From Swiss-Prot:
PTMs per UniProt: The covalent binding of retinal to the apoprotein, bacterioopsin, generates bacteriorhodopsin.
Purpose: Light-driven proton pump.
A Gene Ontology BP annotation from the UniProt entry: proton transmembrane transport
GO cellular component assignments: plasma membrane
Protein localization: Cell membrane
Name of the gene encoding the protein in the UniProt record: bop
Full protein name: Bacteriorhodopsin
SMART domains: Bac_rhodopsin
Family from the record: Belongs to the archaeal/bacterial/fungal opsin family.
Keywords, ordered alphabetically: Cell membrane, Chromophore, Hydrogen ion transport, Ion transport, Membrane, Photoreceptor protein, Pyrrolidone carboxylic acid, Receptor, Retinal protein, Sensory transduction, Transmembrane, Transmembrane helix, Transport
Extracellular side: 59-75, 124-130, 188-199
PANTHER family in UniProt: BACTERIORHODOPSIN _OPSIN, NOPA (EUROFUNG), PTHR28286
Amino acid sequence: TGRPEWIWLALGTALMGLGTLYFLVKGMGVSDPDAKKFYAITTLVPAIAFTMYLSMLLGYGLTMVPFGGEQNPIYWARYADWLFTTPLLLLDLALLVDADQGTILALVGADGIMIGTGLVGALTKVYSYRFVWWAISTAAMLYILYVLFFGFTSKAESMRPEVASTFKVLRNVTVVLWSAYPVVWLIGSEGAGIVPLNIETLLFMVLDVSAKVGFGLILLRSRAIFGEAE
Ligand SMILES: CCCCCCCC/C=C/CCCCCCCC(=O)OC[C@H](O)CO
Ligand SMILES: CCCCCCCC/C=C\CCCCCCCC(=O)OC[C@H](O)CO
Ligand SMILES: CCCCCCCC/C=C\CCCCCCCC(=O)OC[C@H](O)CO
Ligand SMILES: CCCCCCCC/C=C\CCCCCCCC(=O)OC[C@H](O)CO
Ligand SMILES: *C\C=C(C)/C=C/C=C(C)/C=C/C1=C(C)CCCC1(C)C
């Protein structure tokens, strides 16, 4: 392929595909209703990402957006992926702590605003307005991070020890990895253009695989996903 970033899109496609297959074989035979919920949510995440990394590799999920004079290559398929996978990841954390319906709706709604305004900012043609949408999307993300710390952590500390310890590890992983996304976007091709697209694609690939495959490896190997039975 003539695009220098193709090597990272192909590695991303392969790793998401291998991750999906591993979780699929692993979830076979699980009869506990609670564990089936976590396996279903956690296997769909890499399956969706696989299809959208493939679409970028083949060129379907790419568009040209004029801003700053030149034509800029914008991979819109990322936002179709994140629209469906980031809510599912939040659902994994909320069900682990047995969150209430009201708090779950708050997280999913703010997540939808995060991704939706990020997409609008990505396709905006007036350069200075791109950063207005970036700001609003980052405000929605800070609300999500606030709820995970000053809401879920308080309840996790009144549950089973395995639930509290597993949640604390996954909460920490989420806060660090998610926080990197607005930074890469800001200095990358969608924003200031300080980092070239080939390096930007490499960074997102490392973050995406860690946040979906690595996240799932820690969750599905813990005993917190199974109900307390004899
Ligand atoms: C799990 C085990 C795997 C661990 C893997 C962790 C690696 C993460 C990669 C990071 C960024 C790489 C940045 C490389 C930047 C190269 C850009 C460059 O030097 O270009 C020069 C330019 O032409 C003139 O300034
Ligand atoms: C090279 C391989 C490429 C990557 C693979 C192609 C992915 C796209 C195809 C299919 C969906 C397959 C099923 C995905 C849904 C899994 C949900 C699940 O397994 O849930 C378990 C639960 O316990 C049950 O009751
Ligand atoms: C818990 C529920 C799980 C639900 C899981 C649902 C997964 C469907 C996701 C993705 C493939 C992306 C489809 C993107 C559609 C693009 C359509 C299109 O045509 O692009 C616009 C324009 O027309 C182009 O030229
Ligand atoms: C908790 C998560 C926080 C997420 C939100 C954190 C936002 C702060 C980021 C960036 C401003 C960086 C500088 C912007 C000005 C760009 C002009 C410029 O000087 O280029 C960059 C320079 O070469 C090299 O720093
Ligand atoms: C599939 C993996 C994860 C962790 C995806 C995370 C995506 C975000 C946290 C997106 C953040 C954005 C914000 C807050 C502002 C700029 C636009 C983005 C959509 C990249």
